[PDB]
Design an enzyme around this catalytic site. Structure first.
Site, short mmCIF file in Angstrom:
data_model
loop_
_atom_site.label_atom_id
_atom_site.label_comp_id
_atom_site.label_asym_id
_atom_site.label_seq_id
_atom_site.Cartn_x
_atom_site.Cartn_y
_atom_site.Cartn_z
N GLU A 423 3.53 -1.24 -3.94
CA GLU A 423 2.80 -2.24 -2.90
C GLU A 423 1.90 -1.35 -2.07
O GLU A 423 2.13 -1.70 -0.89
CB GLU A 423 4.01 -3.08 -2.15
CG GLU A 423 3.50 -4.39 -1.88
CD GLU A 423 4.62 -5.09 -0.89
OE1 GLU A 423 5.79 -4.69 -0.93
OE2 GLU A 423 4.15 -5.73 0.01
N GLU A 432 -5.09 1.26 2.47
CA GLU A 432 -3.98 1.96 2.75
C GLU A 432 -3.47 3.18 2.12
O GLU A 432 -2.61 3.99 2.47
CB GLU A 432 -2.50 0.96 2.64
CG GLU A 432 -2.59 -0.22 3.43
CD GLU A 432 -1.55 -1.14 3.44
OE1 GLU A 432 -0.53 -0.84 2.44
OE2 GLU A 432 -1.70 -2.31 3.86
N1 LIG Z 1 3.27 8.54 0.55
C1 LIG Z 1 4.25 7.58 0.91
N2 LIG Z 1 5.52 8.03 0.44
C2 LIG Z 1 6.40 7.08 0.66
N3 LIG Z 1 6.48 5.77 1.14
C3 LIG Z 1 5.15 5.67 1.41
C4 LIG Z 1 4.11 6.23 1.37
C5 LIG Z 1 3.11 5.60 1.87
C6 LIG Z 1 3.52 4.41 2.51
N4 LIG Z 1 5.06 4.33 2.21
C7 LIG Z 1 5.55 3.22 2.54
O1 LIG Z 1 5.11 2.35 1.44
C8 LIG Z 1 5.53 0.96 2.08
C9 LIG Z 1 4.51 0.01 1.85
O2 LIG Z 1 3.38 0.13 2.36
C10 LIG Z 1 4.89 -1.56 2.00
C11 LIG Z 1 6.00 -2.16 1.22
C12 LIG Z 1 6.49 -3.34 1.52
C13 LIG Z 1 6.11 -4.04 2.67
CL1 LIG Z 1 6.53 -5.65 3.05
C14 LIG Z 1 5.04 -3.49 3.41
F1 LIG Z 1 4.62 -4.27 4.49
C15 LIG Z 1 4.45 -2.10 2.95
C16 LIG Z 1 5.82 1.23 3.55
O3 LIG Z 1 7.22 0.82 3.91
C17 LIG Z 1 5.32 2.57 3.84
O4 LIG Z 1 6.10 3.22 4.82
#
Ligand SMILES: Nc1ncnc2c1ccn2[C@@H]1O[C@H]([C@H](O)c2ccc(Cl)c(F)c2)[C@@H](O)[C@H]1O
Ligand SMILES: Nc1ncnc2c1ccn2[C@@H]1O[C@H]([C@H](O)c2ccc(Cl)c(F)c2)[C@@H](O)[C@H]1O
Ligand SMILES: Nc1ncnc2c1ccn2[C@@H]1O[C@H]([C@H](O)c2ccc(Cl)c(F)c2)[C@@H](O)[C@H]1O
EC number: 2.1.1.320
Lengths: 625, 298, 625, 318
Positions: A423, A432
């Site tokens: 997501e 993003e």
């Molecule tokens: N390179 C990376 N490696 C590991 N995790 C990563 C990244 C980059 C982002 N994220 C995570 O992805 C999620 C996603 O954007 C999200 C999920 C669910 C909801 Cl509801 C939401 F609002 C947003 C967030 O929790 C971020 O912290």
């Protein structure tokens, strides 16, 4: 639901008149602050030494009634653009005298008419009043949909009313306003009191006012038809225009005399209330976004910043989004594991960016209805969200889910994934940085692995909105470039605006990505055909995503996922508004740029006129890698 | 009511005054009859007096006992002096205009009237039936002045802030016609050459126009400010009284030459009524609450 | 009535603990966000690889509860200023982890302890949390009135507690706080949580906290004595400190275990509510000041600006101000006209700057009380206020009052005055330019005519207040000098401050001006003896005016006219706080400057240290002529 | 400053025109039968270091008329130069007055007032206000030299000049204030889009009861080329006395007068103009008791914002 005002040009006794207007159910009263016929002289003797009080006293009403119930009006004789020098000089002193008296009174609004093409000196005098003292009040420009000269009866033998169509000429009163507010440097205290006439003009005339700051709509009693039982009603064409104005939350003003004496004057107001209660019911998006209309926010950067708990909670409240994700994984499990392998083949699912766990639960719900075996890995770099995941794992998920506290680009995975679920998309699809994140995770996906989502495309559309352009203008800050606010996108629930052309796709990303070179950098040229005369202020941005085959998500209005209210459109402003005539083409250029540290967009308008390149090298906006 | 709006002499010499309060606490009007013009405008020495609910923008005598008034409330009102001529009671108050009725004029027969308003409309009234016979959205701005033909019911003049002087003939399918300089502010038909009229502009100029060969005959820079009124004397070779916001009264001949000039008023000169009894006596009223009786050197 | 909170280091179950706290009557709960004893490792293997959830989940309370009921707490083992590098490194990582989790949770406040002299790295790590991500959160620094070392029992045989008075030594915990907030650059998000102990120190130590941003007062249960009935009470000295703290609206916090066992636990709160209800009652000046405390405003400029109708209304709402003016006019008429001349003598009274007529009415009431004849002239340059005066003159006053719509320095008066009456004074006496206005009116005053007021004097007092210093600092604006806010006076109801020396007269003006040439330009030097250790942040300004003989008005605290509260004091800030030691003298210099268009003040401190001259040449602030 | 007076004094054409204007006026006022009886009171208002006092002396020798000079000057630094000149050369003939012409209570009344209170945009140094304040001490039949002045505007195109104004951004002020103030510049790389048209005119002495030095002007400039509008060049013309005149309007420029450069009123945003279109500009000369300023807007082919509303970026001190 309907805030209404009474417009009078005769107020013999203000306490008496206010008592009757309030009795009639009106919320406010527009009235003259000086007698409309009391012409005053400021230069020549003996008229300039006229004694007595110049108007009625401020003591007649309480300060709160002055602040809330009275809207002042400029005297009709005040003509600052008169071709007679003396009338012009007298009208300037009289205009400041009336505006200053209104400020002295603390009036919440003051009406001034735009009833001719030239209003330069009226604008200079009003701009001057704005730049004097610390009063802060609203200015309402009374401006009709149709100029009087164009709605008159054809009864002048040697001056016939032209029956031939003149497209631009029918929009002349929009140009009246546009020039006036341009001269007044887009003051946020200058707004539109749109005057609605008996016969509506063409649609293109009504549409010139989309995106304009309409604060009031003036309904004369003479436009009202009479129904079966003799009560005042309006035409169906007028009613539809009323419904648009209700969405903008305008204040309706009833002007003219009582022409339905048998039914009283509150009957006009009661009919307006009937249309208000029986307005065409709104959608759940309208119910949800109530409060966020044209409110600019910064697009989330969940890679660079650690999202707060309540931010996860708002994005998790989307049953449509998560059911689409569940359906996409359900279909993929069936397509990967045949019935003869229902127990032997365990599928390695890796949720990249697991958040607090709504996609992990969607992966669990998709394995129960698909009756397939899965081994989950919930990867997440936000240590704060990992606390939620590890408490979920210990109390409910168990050994089934392995929680990984890492960035997907650094993680050395023990196993290889059959499916990667993420997501990592924003309102402009790749804003993003989903391409960079999923690219870094490709080494641990099987040679036949499936990424969900498989594809995403962003869409741009040229928009017109003097309300939004003013909102961006207000985002100026200390200690930075004074124009940096126009070189960065905003996430906004777009409300009072006009889409000038249909959204066209901008940038598309496919996952997994084969092509040896990768390069997430892009360059796109878009040509938008415009069929209207308008002012370009920026571009609305949306996205479309293919989760798996026929299962998709969208915020592109024409294909919007029924019920998905989480993501609002994005807005890329432009520093200077661009005039566009009907039949012209708006050509925009978008670049997706990047270095090892940050990713950003740059953009320029190249037709009908060029703009500067916005955000060169990410000087005002970058997305952190 | 300090601001005197109108002064009109009837056949016998009774002076009718129209007045309003354009400032202070109350913004109302008043109608007055002075069978002794020398006692004007002292309220304790009048024959008849009434207080109207809103200001008086214009008025006209309807015969000898009727008074038609253009009100601030948008109404056209008809008042009537009773048998003894001690009371001025209301007969009709019809709100048909959507803004200040600025001008009123009784047509030739004394059976119809033409009203003009800030709402841009011109209405024709049947006084006896108390209804509006016709409404004409002809102008593109406030109707400044409406002046009925001295002898034809279907003929009358109008002027407006849209720079138009219209010559009307309701017998045509398109009744109005544009007449051949600043904005027109006042109109006066010649009482002898019934195919000739005068008009005053917002720059002080007074012009003489011929209806047939419409192309403006003569003009004079009479005033330094807006011409509020033009009134013809009862003489067979009449004089023209011109009044202005410059607070002065002028009296012109047939070549628009100044014969008399009165700077007696200290505020705007609103009206001028020549006495039926002494044709050299002209009476002007003003916003200074002064009733000035002049002796024109005829 | 008293906003309270419960401090706990033991929360076995968050919902049960919260429910128990709420049952006892507390508005909030201070608690740890990680287990206080759960020491964590970030650098070394194998303890750094500790699994499971690192703390409780955010899913245990609603976002509304996390936002309003929880105050986070730094774990007692976190020591970023340890002399052991390993502990310093682990403590930095754990301090960020905890602050970040509190930000993730949306906690409204977070407690951090100042329990030793050096907190340099603690400050650096907090500053770097404040400069990372998205903010709003408050940081409450837990600092004791008396350091634990200074209140320990004298039970160490070879380490006796010092019996010597050490004036500055007893004030050491203020310096702990001061150095910390100086390192953190006076962040508005950093406040004091003042901890009170069993024994209170000398008043000078308590007084060190005057003007500090105290947001909470920590009352441990062990400081409460037990009354004859078993109820927790406080010593009379502690009760005095509580009344002082209620005036600042601090949130009271109850820390420690329940020591009134048979007497329940809500008894500590019951006692606080008892002191709150039975506190010394607020006076009429405190009643009116509500909501205006330490709120900076621009001083009014009635000569340059036309005051609004509602501004005139607040300054007329002073019955004391007008009863004094009436008494001064009444007494003056008696001295000028003897009883034998009571019917033949007409006194020409001129009110200069009549506003909406309150001084005209007071002149009328004084002439009737004295049985003397007066001819009144109401002079007023604000044409909007002249409207009010002319409607008063027509309706009630009559020919006795001649309303003059003019500036007193331009008016060609038709007669001379026996008495001139004016209220052209401001909060710093001559700041509205009464000298220049009344000098312009001197030509039409009789050679023996009286001026009411006849004299006025401004006063100054040095003040300490880090709260007001931070309010001034936040007034930085774009398109101007980044320090202009420190070089202009503010009308402010001073509340959280320390007056450091008795007020001293600054500038004095007399009317009529018998002195030839005279000049309204001034230069004044003031020496203020200081008896405390402090930080100077500016000067409070006040005035006194002699209306006539012994009839006077004053806002100088020690001679204040009781009941007159229309005028709040002025504040002249300084760019940089200045350290003042006890026994030192603060020397200030003040100039009253002018040209033909403007008047302004300039000021500098010359001792114990110099400052720059403030507002040189009216570069940041002028009063319009 | 001293060296500023020196640069403006180095203009033989300007001072010879002034000499010729006074010479002609002396002849027209004093007939040959009064060559000794009628002494003419000349008041130089704003005398500077003394080049107009010497022009008044040179015009009395060649006209063979008697004059009584009064050199009024408010700059005390320039008064030092004048009083040293008076003591060493002029003598009793010249009375040096250290005052503002608007405050000075003159002992006598002037037959002629001579002044150099004009700028590149004619009234931009506030000559109308200064000469208005000096009218009470001029004879009922007095002559002001100069008798009239008119400013001229012309639309210009210059991406080089527009960039130069753009570079005048400063700290601690409005980031666009540089475009809301005029500059004196020797215009070199530019294109004049249309012929200069008169803007504001002032006549001295001024009769009309009301005075009002405030003005409002609308100008329509026909453009025959496709171009980009960046601002307006400003110039002046002055009538010293009858056929004796000065000018910086290029087409009528005084041969040899190099002192005054044209003025430039910029616009915030450049305006595209096609051949056959009309550039309509609006100029206002505004004022209060303290300052005078200009405000300006473009209204065709497109509108601009009103520049310098209320003198927020530029005012001329009174
Ligand atoms: N390179 C990376 N490696 C590991 N995790 C990563 C990244 C980059 C982002 N994220 C995570 O992805 C999620 C996603 O954007 C999200 C999920 C669910 C909801 Cl509801 C939401 F609002 C947003 C967030 O929790 C971020 O912290
Ligand atoms: N030179 C001048 N000549 C004539 N009037 C002048 C001046 C300068 C100021 N004023 C007026 O003095 C009044 C006074 O300050 C005032 C009165 C009452 C209340 Cl309640 C109040 F708030 C303020 C104001 O109304 C000012 O307009
Ligand atoms: N109201 C006033 N009353 C008295 N003097 C006034 C004014 C206003 C300006 N001046 C003076 O006029 C001179 C003039 O501008 C000038 C003269 C000669 C040269 Cl070469 C030159 F550069 C400039 C300057 O010396 C100004 O100081």
């Amino acid at each position: 639901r309907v805030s209404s005002g009474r417009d009078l040009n005769c107020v013999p006794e203000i306490a008496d008149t206010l008592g009757a207007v309030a009795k009639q159910g009106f919320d406010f009263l527009c009235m003259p602050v000086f007698h409309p016929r009391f012409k005053r002289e400021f230069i020549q003797e003996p008229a300039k030494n006229r004694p007595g009080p110049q108007t009625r006293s401020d003591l007649l009403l309480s300060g709160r009634d002055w602040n809330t119930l009275i809207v002042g009006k400029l005297s009709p004789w005040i003509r600052p653009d008169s071709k007679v020098e003396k009338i012009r000089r007298n009208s300037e002193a009289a205009m400041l005298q009336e505006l200053n008296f209104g400020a002295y009174l603390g009036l919440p609004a003051f009406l001034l008419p735009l009833n001719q093409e030239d209003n330069t000196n009226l604008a200079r005098v009003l701009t001057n009043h704005i730049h004097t003292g610390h009063h802060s009040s609203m200015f309402w420009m009374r401006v009709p949909l149709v100029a009087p000269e164009d709605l008159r009866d054809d009864i002048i033998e040697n001056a016939p009313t032209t029956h031939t169509e003149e497209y631009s000429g029918e929009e002349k009163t929009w140009m009246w306003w546009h020039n006036f507010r341009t001269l007044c440097d887009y003051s946020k205290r200058i707004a539109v009191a749109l005057e609605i006439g008996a016969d509506l003009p063409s649609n293109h005339v009504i549409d010139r006012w989309l995106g304009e700051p309409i604060k009031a709509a003036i309904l004369p009693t003479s436009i009202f038809l009479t129904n079966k039982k003799g009560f005042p009603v309006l035409s169906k064409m007028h009613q539809r225009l009323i419904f648009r104005l209700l969405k903008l939350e305008v204040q309706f003003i009833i002007t003219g005399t009582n022409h339905h004496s048998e039914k009283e004057f509150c009957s006009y107001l009661q009919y307006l209330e009937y249309l208000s209660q029986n307005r065409p019911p709104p959608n759940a998006y309208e119910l949800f976004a109530k409060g966020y209309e044209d409110y600019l926010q910064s697009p989330l950067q969940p890679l660079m910043d650690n999202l707060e708990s309540q931010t996860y909670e708002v994005f998790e409240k989307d049953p449509i989004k998560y059911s689409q994700y569940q359906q996409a994984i359900y279909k993929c499990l069936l397509d990967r594991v045949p019935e003869e392998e229902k127990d032997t083949n365990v599928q390695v699912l890796m949720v990249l960016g697991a958040g607090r766990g709504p996609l992990v639960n969607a992966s669990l719900r998709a394995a129960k209805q698909a009756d397939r075996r899965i081994k989950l890995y919930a990867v997440e770099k936000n240590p704060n969200a990992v606390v939620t995941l590890e408490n979920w794992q210990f109390e409910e998920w168990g050994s089934q889910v392995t929680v990984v506290s890492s960035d997907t680009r650094e993680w050395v995975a023990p196993e290889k994934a059959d499916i990667i679920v993420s997501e990592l998309l924003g309102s402009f699809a790749d804003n993003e940085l989903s391409p960079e994140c999923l690219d870094g995770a490709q080494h641990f996906l099987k040679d036949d692995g499936v990424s969900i989502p498989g594809e995403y495309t962003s869409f741009l559309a040229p928009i017109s909105s003097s309300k939004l352009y003013n909102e961006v203008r207000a985002c100026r800050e200390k200690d930075r470039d004074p124009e940096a606010q126009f070189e960065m996108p905003y996430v906004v629930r777009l409300h009072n605006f006009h889409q000038l052309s249909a959204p066209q796709p901008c940038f598309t990303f496919s996952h997994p990505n084969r092509d040896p070179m990768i390069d997430n950098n892009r360059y796109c040229t878009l040509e938008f055909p415009v069929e209207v005369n308008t002012v370009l202020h920026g571009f609305a941005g949306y996205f479309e995503t293919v989760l798996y085959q026929d299962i998709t998500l969208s915020i592109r209005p024409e294909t919007h996922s029924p019920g998905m209210f989480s993501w609002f459109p994005i807005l890329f402003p432009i520093k200077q508004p661009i005039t566009v005539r009907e039949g012209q083409t708006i050509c925009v250029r978008f670049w997706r740029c990047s270095n090892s540290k940050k990713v950003w967009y740059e953009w320029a308008v190249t037709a009908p006129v060029c703009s500067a390149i916005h955000n060169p090298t990410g000087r005002s906006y970058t997305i952190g890698l | 009511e300090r601001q005197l709006e109108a002064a009109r002499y009837r056949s016998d010499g009774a002076l009718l005054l129209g007045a309003s309060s354009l400032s202070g606490r109350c913004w109302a009007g008043s109608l007055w009859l002075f069978k002794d013009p020398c006692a004007a405008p002292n309220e304790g020495f009048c024959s008849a007096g009434v207080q109207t609910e809103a200001g008086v923008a214009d008025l006209t005598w309807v015969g000898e006992r009727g008074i038609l008034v253009a009100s601030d409330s948008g109404a056209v009102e008809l008042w009537e002096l009773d048998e003894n001529e001690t009371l001025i009671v209301s007969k009709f108050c019809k709100y048909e205009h959507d803004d200040i009725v600025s001008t009123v004029s009784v047509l030739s027969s004394g059976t119809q009237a033409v009203s003009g308003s800030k709402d841009i409309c011109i209405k024709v009234w049947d006084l006896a039936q108390q209804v509006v016979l016709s409404s004409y959205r002809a102008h593109a701005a406030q109707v400044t002045c409406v002046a009925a033909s001295p002898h034809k019911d279907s003929v009358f003049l109008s002027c407006s802030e849209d720079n138009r002087i219209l010559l009307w003939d309701t017998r045509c399918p398109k009744p109005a016609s544009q007449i051949g300089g600043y904005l027109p502010t006042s109109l006066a038909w010649h009482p002898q050459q019934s195919e000739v009229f005068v008009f005053g502009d917002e720059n002080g100029t007074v012009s003489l126009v011929d209806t047939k060969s419409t192309s403006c005959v003569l003009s004079s820079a009479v005033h330094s400010q807006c011409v509020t009124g033009l009134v013809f004397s009862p003489h067979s070779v009449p004089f023209l009284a011109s009044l202005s916001e410059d607070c002065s009264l002028a009296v012109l001949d047939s070549s628009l030459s100044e014969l008399f000039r009165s700077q007696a008023h200290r505020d705007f000169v609103r009206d001028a009524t020549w006495s039926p009894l002494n044709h050299s006596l002209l009476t002007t009223v003003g916003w200074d609450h002064q009733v000035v009786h002049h002796v024109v050197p005829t």
